[PDB]
Amino acid sequence: GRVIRGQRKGAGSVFRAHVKHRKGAARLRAVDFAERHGYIKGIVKDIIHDPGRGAPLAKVVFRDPYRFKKRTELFIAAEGIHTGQFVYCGKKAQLNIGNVLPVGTMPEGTIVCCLEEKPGDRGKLARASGNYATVISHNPETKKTRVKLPSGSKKVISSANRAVVGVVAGGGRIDKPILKAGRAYHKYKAKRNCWPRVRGVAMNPVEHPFGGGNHQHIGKPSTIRRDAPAGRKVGLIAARRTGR
RNA sequence: GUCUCGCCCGCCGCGCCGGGGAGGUGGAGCACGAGCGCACGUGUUAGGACCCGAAAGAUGGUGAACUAUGCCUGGGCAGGGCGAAGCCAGAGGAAACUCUGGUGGAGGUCCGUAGCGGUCCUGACGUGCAAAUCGGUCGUCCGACCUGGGUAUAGGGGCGAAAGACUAAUCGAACCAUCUAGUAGCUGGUUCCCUCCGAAGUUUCCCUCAGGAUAGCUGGCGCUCUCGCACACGCAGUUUUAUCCGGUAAAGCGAAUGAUUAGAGGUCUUGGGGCCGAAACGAUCUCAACCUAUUCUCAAACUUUAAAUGGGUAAGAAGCCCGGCUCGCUGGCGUGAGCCGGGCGUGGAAUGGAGUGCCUAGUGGGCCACUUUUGGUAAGCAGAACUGG
RNA sequence: ACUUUGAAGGCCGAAGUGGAGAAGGGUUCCAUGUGAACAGCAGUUGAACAUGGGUCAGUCGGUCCUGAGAGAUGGGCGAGCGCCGUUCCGAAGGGACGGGCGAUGGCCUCCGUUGCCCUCGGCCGAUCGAAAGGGAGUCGGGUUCAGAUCCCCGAAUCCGG
RNA sequence: GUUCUCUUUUCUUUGUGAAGGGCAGGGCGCCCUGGAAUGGGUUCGCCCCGAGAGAGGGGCCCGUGCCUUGGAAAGCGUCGCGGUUCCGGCGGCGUCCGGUGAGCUCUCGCUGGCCCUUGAAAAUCCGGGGGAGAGGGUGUAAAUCUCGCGCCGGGCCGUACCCAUAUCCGCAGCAGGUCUCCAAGGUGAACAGCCUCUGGCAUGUUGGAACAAUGUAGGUAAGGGAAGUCGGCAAGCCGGA
RNA sequence: UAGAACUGGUGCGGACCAGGGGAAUCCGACUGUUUAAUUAAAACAAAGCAUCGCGAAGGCCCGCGGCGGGUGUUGACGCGAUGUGAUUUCUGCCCAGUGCUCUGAAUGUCAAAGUGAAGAAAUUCAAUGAAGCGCGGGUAAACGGCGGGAGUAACUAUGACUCUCUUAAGGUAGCCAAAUGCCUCGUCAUCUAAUUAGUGACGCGCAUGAAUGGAUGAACGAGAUUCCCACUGUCCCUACCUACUAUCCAGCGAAACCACAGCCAAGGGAACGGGCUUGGCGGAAUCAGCGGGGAAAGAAGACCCUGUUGAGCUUGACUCUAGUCUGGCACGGUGAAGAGACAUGUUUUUUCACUGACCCGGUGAGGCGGGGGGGCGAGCCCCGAGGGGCUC
RNA sequence: UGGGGCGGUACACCUGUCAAACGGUAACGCAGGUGUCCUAAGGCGAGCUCAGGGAGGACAGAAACCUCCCGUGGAGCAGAAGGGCAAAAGCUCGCUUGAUCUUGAUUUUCAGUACGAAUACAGACCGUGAAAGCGGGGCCUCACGAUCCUUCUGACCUUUUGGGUUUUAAGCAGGAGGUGUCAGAAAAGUUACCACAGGGAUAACUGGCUUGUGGCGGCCAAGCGUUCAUAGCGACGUCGCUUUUUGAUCCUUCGAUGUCGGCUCUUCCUAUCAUUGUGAAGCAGAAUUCACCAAGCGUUGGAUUGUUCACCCACUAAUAGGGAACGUGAGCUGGGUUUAGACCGUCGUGAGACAGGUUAGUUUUACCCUACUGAUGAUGUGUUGUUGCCAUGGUAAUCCUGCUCAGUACGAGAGGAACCGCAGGUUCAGACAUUUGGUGUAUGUGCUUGGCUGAGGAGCCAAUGGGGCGAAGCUACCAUCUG
Ligand SMILES: [Mg+2]
Ligand SMILES: [Mg+2]
Ligand SMILES: [Mg+2]
Ligand SMILES: [Mg+2]
Ligand SMILES: [Mg+2]
Ligand SMILES: [Mg+2]
Ligand SMILES: [Mg+2]
Ligand SMILES: [Mg+2]
Ligand SMILES: [Mg+2]
Ligand SMILES: [Mg+2]
Ligand SMILES: [Mg+2]
Ligand SMILES: [Mg+2]
Ligand SMILES: [Mg+2]
Ligand SMILES: [Mg+2]
Ligand SMILES: [Mg+2]
Ligand SMILES: [Mg+2]
Ligand SMILES: [Mg+2]
Ligand SMILES: [Mg+2]
Ligand SMILES: [Mg+2]
Ligand SMILES: [Mg+2]
Ligand SMILES: [Mg+2]
Ligand SMILES: [Mg+2]
Ligand SMILES: [Mg+2]
Ligand SMILES: [Mg+2]
Ligand SMILES: [Mg+2]
Ligand SMILES: [Mg+2]
Ligand SMILES: [Mg+2]
Ligand SMILES: [Mg+2]
Ligand SMILES: [Mg+2]
Ligand SMILES: [Mg+2]
Ligand SMILES: [Mg+2]
Ligand SMILES: [Mg+2]
Ligand SMILES: [Mg+2]
Ligand SMILES: [Mg+2]
Ligand SMILES: [Mg+2]
Ligand SMILES: [Mg+2]
Ligand SMILES: [Mg+2]
Ligand SMILES: [Mg+2]
Ligand SMILES: [Mg+2]
Ligand SMILES: [Mg+2]
Ligand SMILES: [Mg+2]
Ligand SMILES: [Mg+2]
Ligand SMILES: [Mg+2]
Ligand SMILES: [Mg+2]
Ligand SMILES: [Mg+2]
Ligand SMILES: [Mg+2]
Ligand SMILES: [Mg+2]
Ligand SMILES: [Mg+2]
Ligand SMILES: [Mg+2]
Ligand SMILES: [Mg+2]
Ligand SMILES: [Mg+2]
Ligand SMILES: [Mg+2]
Ligand SMILES: [Mg+2]
Ligand SMILES: [Mg+2]
Ligand SMILES: [Mg+2]
Ligand SMILES: [Mg+2]
Ligand SMILES: [Mg+2]
Ligand SMILES: [Mg+2]
Ligand SMILES: [Mg+2]
Ligand SMILES: [Mg+2]
Ligand SMILES: [Mg+2]
Ligand SMILES: [Mg+2]
Ligand SMILES: [Mg+2]
Ligand SMILES: [Mg+2]
Ligand SMILES: [Mg+2]
Ligand SMILES: [Mg+2]
Ligand SMILES: [Mg+2]
Ligand SMILES: [Mg+2]
Ligand SMILES: [Mg+2]
Ligand SMILES: [Mg+2]
Ligand SMILES: [Mg+2]
Ligand SMILES: [Mg+2]
Ligand SMILES: [Mg+2]
Ligand SMILES: [Mg+2]
Ligand SMILES: [Mg+2]
Ligand SMILES: [Mg+2]
Ligand SMILES: [Mg+2]
Ligand SMILES: [Mg+2]
Ligand SMILES: [Mg+2]
């Protein structure tokens, strides 16, 4: 046959990302003495729009504990913040919107964002537009804590992971329809080369296994085993249900 | 060498050494050696293999100056129509609000130039201006827009708003060189003369039916003999004299098997749309069949009978006769076969020189006519026997 | 008939059949002469043939910077020519400086200096990459068969020492 | 230039660079007094005001425009001289007043709208901040994020012409294709189409004679009006305000 | 810009510029894209709708190779993979078949290595026993599929009703002689002088039917069809005109093709001759045309057959393979509990904990653990109230 | 393989016939069979009689069982058919296991090779019979399979590698495990995106032979026709022609004969629709029906449909049938069919198929030879001219209406003709332009838009600026003349 689409994406060179106009990488500042034991202060300067994203980004400025210099960080913004706000980071912080502190000092039932998965990954989880995690249960024996994620899954992590307090800005976006095509075009043009999906049935059987026929039809069951090879692993993968 | 019955020998150490006869048998063997080397010719093969002839497969490499798509950075697009929110004023209303007149200038909106494209004329040209042009008529024209240059992706791979489309006039797998004189049961071609002999298209086997092997048909090279050499035997798409074989033509059914017509003597006899009647075998008919003697017609898969043409043997010296020997075979005594030694030549017609052995090519698609003959309405149709072309 | 000069009649109609340039071409440019060949007829003509001549910069462009991206070192992998990868498993800059120490040739005054002892040192990755992006500062007049923001005249200006 | 009749007529020509100094003119999200409703000011539109409007007086930026130095000597237009000529030659005049615009183009500013799009980086240069570090004596201090004036230099490579119905690619002087700048008069809504001036050309690889047939491109037709034909195919009607 | 008079042989957007309309059905919502050089379409795309996997030692994928690389300067309002196709109004039953998926020691089967008995030893035997296949559940906006006979209503005909045989269910709401109906030019109405056409109705539908999407319905279409008004040389029926040619002359000057050649009837023949046979007949060299023949030119017929010649594509053909699931040996170390088969200790094993090989992330490798010199303080003990012990 | 595919097996075997009297002999020729069955249905000996038919006998009947007579096979012998068999080869009883071990020869098919099957002998061991003798499978004709590999049986059997012993392995001889495509490969589809070497040894058009089917026509004559075989029809039967129907065949053509239908144009046939000249009726008149000579002149306008065919409207003397490579594509068109894209239904798991439907889709070349039409010229006559004759060839005129004859003849009536005459028309043909119309660049004369020659006048430019009237000429059943 011939190699198909999808099997061409994993090599890159035409399906790569478009990163000329992106401003940086969002991540929470590193761990150090002050943030481990005490706290530290910083100030917001401006709020900005990052392409390829829905969540706006803050700019925070800190005073370096060891040199006569200043140090800038590019956080992801909770909902409520503004310029001129003082932002306090670390263990001795007060529980209010915009600050950063650990999990095992928070109470139950509280909201967070830009959470960490392991202690010092600078922030990985719950960092999209309108989402938030939630604290559930502590365990001062063994230093563990459980967290609800926006997929509806309960997950265990430590009590030294850091996190940011509050929902994320951009909240409520998929409740606007797009109505046109060229609003989609300017969307994905800033992210990837991916938008027009040609249906497999309108192909020929060289370049897709569902292709061909005098009619348009699939001909075979659209579910497929997890361990099928590349080229055939298309459709409803490992489906344990179909319908609704 | 190999089975079957067997009685014996020699050896300083007797076995699980060695020897006879034959029912007999398996062998590319013996029996008074013929090869070895050199050259020439023909023939069958393996090699580029008489010459030219593919679609294709592998190894290694050049290409995105056309086109497909993504990114970087720069440029470009008359004049007009409809009139969304928002704003002002006047009038009405108890209020919420409403009516009328302006302003404003949004929109993958409308008409239309530049530009980008490419519907119809199924027009022109159709050895052209042109390996895809020209003319008028067309489509869209603030936007999923048009475009320059730079940069990324390379061949069972790339890119694709998908048509199996494009990838340097080439794409249902590019091009360049080599492997490579790839293979071909298949087409086309194969170079001077005279003489001589002179065919087949048929059998059996083959994943065989456009082809090969096998036998047959043909040629060449010989060799053993003999004759008008006063001096003979042997042969034959032939006739004759004797003698066997056959079941086809015709004929036959008052003879078997099978089929079939009609009336005379049988209610033979079952029963009657019924029959004169209580009906019966009292009668009286008959019918599907049915006893006796006769009658008309039939047979590729029936036959008592039985040709014409045909096939096979025989027509003498390898015969006849006389006498005697050998035999585990057979046995009243004897038969049979084999060996020995002697005596007796024309054995129906008409013809002519016979026999034997190696090498060996081309063929292996057939066709017609009398006569016989199968299928088919018939055929310049299809399939066979005889002879001749 | 076709060159040239004059006169007359006509077309292009400023999104041009006009005046200048990029890519590409490469002497085709300018004068004198020729009429074999070529210019699908002709030619006293020619972008043809022959012989000669012609492109002048502190200020116009390159050169400098980086862009998408390409690409060495260390390291890793690989039969092997080599390939991956660009801050990633690296003692990664010779960077400089104020002070002290003996020396230095010039009238060792002032120096740089080969040399150290000190002394502050991050950067964070060699290099390449656009004659349309970014990037100090020149204008008018005149002059040739053919050259001018370059030659001559006259008025200015940037950088460095 | 026209004048046979008219035409105070029609046509052409009628200027000052770079770099400075001064001033018009536009813009300000700049300051000082002062305290606003009977709410005011104000744009085509918007829009603004005790977080200080209107009204008064001030400051800053751009000032491609006018004046001035350049610079009238030079250039141009006319009427005349000399040099045989081999001449940037010599003279006499002039190089002037005003005005309108939904006018076209180029530019500078103000302001608003659209975006699940938010619209490059680096070389290089600059100012500020405690003064770190210090440095130097009444005539010194050397840097200097510098006042005016003589000085010295500024290397290498390209630069001719064509840029297209004849210098490029298409085998060719091929009706094809190939990125940009400048852009007048009239009609008209208009860079539509029709005629003209500046500048360019000789009809697009040849000419003369005559007007048969069939062609190709254009047109017109009495009366009827799709009866034609697979099919109103092609042509024709309507057409702007 | 609006109005009035007068004037012209009704001519007046006077040239150029410059929309034919109307009534209806089928498809696709629209704008957009598309087979360069025969197809611009009803085909692709879209917005909207719905499912599917995934919480990073991950999902999808690349790769000869590696602390390799893309999505990823990412984190479920996201990334990847699939089908339908705006809105409105709806989305019916079947888990028997096939696929997918969950668990599972409690059950057959099930390889290497390992365990044990016999043998002089190769060897043989036995017990053991992973994933997978079977055993069992869930799923149809997953591939897909969704029936026959007979009797029956006070005139006939129909047949609401009843019976019956089997299937995983036996076609629901809608719609139809359609771009889907063989029999077929189905039947009835209308349009027409006349209609195999077209519109509206009927429906035991060879073979319609529900995201393999059903039914509708404004605007748009270089889309496919029927009719009407105005219009016309499309036609009755052809004619006239103008330009460039063709034609003649001067000058320059090719090609394809070509056995030999070039008047007919009939006859026979490889059955349709320019040439043969029997008859007809036969007179130099040429000019403009036209298209009957030359079975006229081009391209070793793509239709059909054969070939023990090929290639593209698919799968339940045959033989294999990358990748991937799983068991075993090595890298593999420390300690502690529990329980075993033989036989009267052996190793085995399940579990818990450790770190030093190994792996991961972060950083300009910037303040780790104990300790009390700490002390601003607190609460717990002794407490000379002065001390030190504990929690911080 | 009477083209291939679907079907069948004529692909290994048996009987009868065809097959032409030895033997042998073909076709998808006729009729049928096989891939088995048997511890006896094999083998020896002995004894007996089959099918059926008749006559009798308690229940007893068409048929149970008993007895007698006739009985040439008319019954049986495993299966298909054929042959053969009576104190058997059949039925029944007794005993057994020649269905065993071993060489070689021959026959059948045939090359004169193999398998298989069969025959006659020889050596052994045996069985049955009193014994002669018979028996090494089934009364005869068919019932089955190589190398290589594996497994089993056998001999105090050879080798296992420098010698010896034991195990294993290899060898020798004989059975079995199997190839049905049966003298013996290990094996699924699709291509409309397709390709190559060849083929008229082989198909889809014409042509050619045949004429079943289709069409047309004769013979004899039972009945129809109230009566009356034959005015006109004609059963049951039978003899023929034609190639405008569809088949059968496969001779030419596969290095190419351009494949449906309409448009256009010419010629030919007759099996006569009408018109001319005539005959016959169940012909009073008028209309109609059968037939003869005859192919001269005619046979139309339209809705539907791609149409050939069909069907309806309207007029007409009439609305007849055919051909020529199923006339005619360097003459048109390209609607359909018959490439490439695509949509529905049915089938296939699927790529894909449909003899089902629907939409969009490149139609080349003449300047050669001939023929055909027109145009110059040529031979000879001494040269040249004027006037003329004729061979030979073509060939052209055709139909209808009206008034009169006449509301006459005829006929009961209703109704209803014709011959000569007069005037006019249709289709065709040949010229012509007095008059009407059309053309119009005489670029003739006015009018008018935009622009340009300073303006007026006179003029030009806009591939014929537009528009109005229009001479000569060319032209029309759209005007006229003639046959
Ligand atoms: Mg799609
Ligand atoms: Mg497709
Ligand atoms: Mg596939
Ligand atoms: Mg299906
Ligand atoms: Mg050879
Ligand atoms: Mg070759
Ligand atoms: Mg191969
Ligand atoms: Mg390139
Ligand atoms: Mg096209
Ligand atoms: Mg055309
Ligand atoms: Mg032509
Ligand atoms: Mg030309
Ligand atoms: Mg396709
Ligand atoms: Mg060769
Ligand atoms: Mg041959
Ligand atoms: Mg062959
Ligand atoms: Mg006979
Ligand atoms: Mg031979
Ligand atoms: Mg120029
Ligand atoms: Mg120019
Ligand atoms: Mg250039
Ligand atoms: Mg010339
Ligand atoms: Mg020149
Ligand atoms: Mg550089
Ligand atoms: Mg630049
Ligand atoms: Mg103020
Ligand atoms: Mg130049
Ligand atoms: Mg013009
Ligand atoms: Mg000329
Ligand atoms: Mg030219
Ligand atoms: Mg007319
Ligand atoms: Mg019509
Ligand atoms: Mg018609
Ligand atoms: Mg039209
Ligand atoms: Mg409908
Ligand atoms: Mg559409
Ligand atoms: Mg095309
Ligand atoms: Mg929807
Ligand atoms: Mg689905
Ligand atoms: Mg459903
Ligand atoms: Mg299931
Ligand atoms: Mg229904
Ligand atoms: Mg209908
Ligand atoms: Mg119609
Ligand atoms: Mg269905
Ligand atoms: Mg469907
Ligand atoms: Mg000519
Ligand atoms: Mg002839
Ligand atoms: Mg003939
Ligand atoms: Mg010929
Ligand atoms: Mg011809
Ligand atoms: Mg061929
Ligand atoms: Mg070929
Ligand atoms: Mg073969
Ligand atoms: Mg290939
Ligand atoms: Mg399989
Ligand atoms: Mg065959
Ligand atoms: Mg015979
Ligand atoms: Mg007996
Ligand atoms: Mg017997
Ligand atoms: Mg014996
Ligand atoms: Mg050994
Ligand atoms: Mg040994
Ligand atoms: Mg197809
Ligand atoms: Mg007949
Ligand atoms: Mg044929
Ligand atoms: Mg033939
Ligand atoms: Mg034949
Ligand atoms: Mg031809
Ligand atoms: Mg021809
Ligand atoms: Mg006749
Ligand atoms: Mg024809
Ligand atoms: Mg043609
Ligand atoms: Mg022709
Ligand atoms: Mg068509
Ligand atoms: Mg098609
Ligand atoms: Mg005559
Ligand atoms: Mg005028
Ligand atoms: Mg007129």
Curated annotation (Swiss-Prot):
(3S)-3-hydroxyhistidine modifications at: 215
Compartment(s) where it occurs, according to its Swiss-Prot or TrEMBL record: Cytoplasm
GO biological process, one term: cytoplasmic translation
Top-level taxon in the UniProt lineage: Eukaryota
GO cellular component: a single term: cytosolic large ribosomal subunit
Subunit-structure text: Component of the large ribosomal subunit. Interacts with CRY1.
HAMAP family reported for this sequence: Ribosomal_uL2_A (MF_01320_A)
Family: Belongs to the universal ribosomal protein uL2 family.
Protein name, UniProt field: Large ribosomal subunit protein uL2
Gene it is expressed from: RPL8
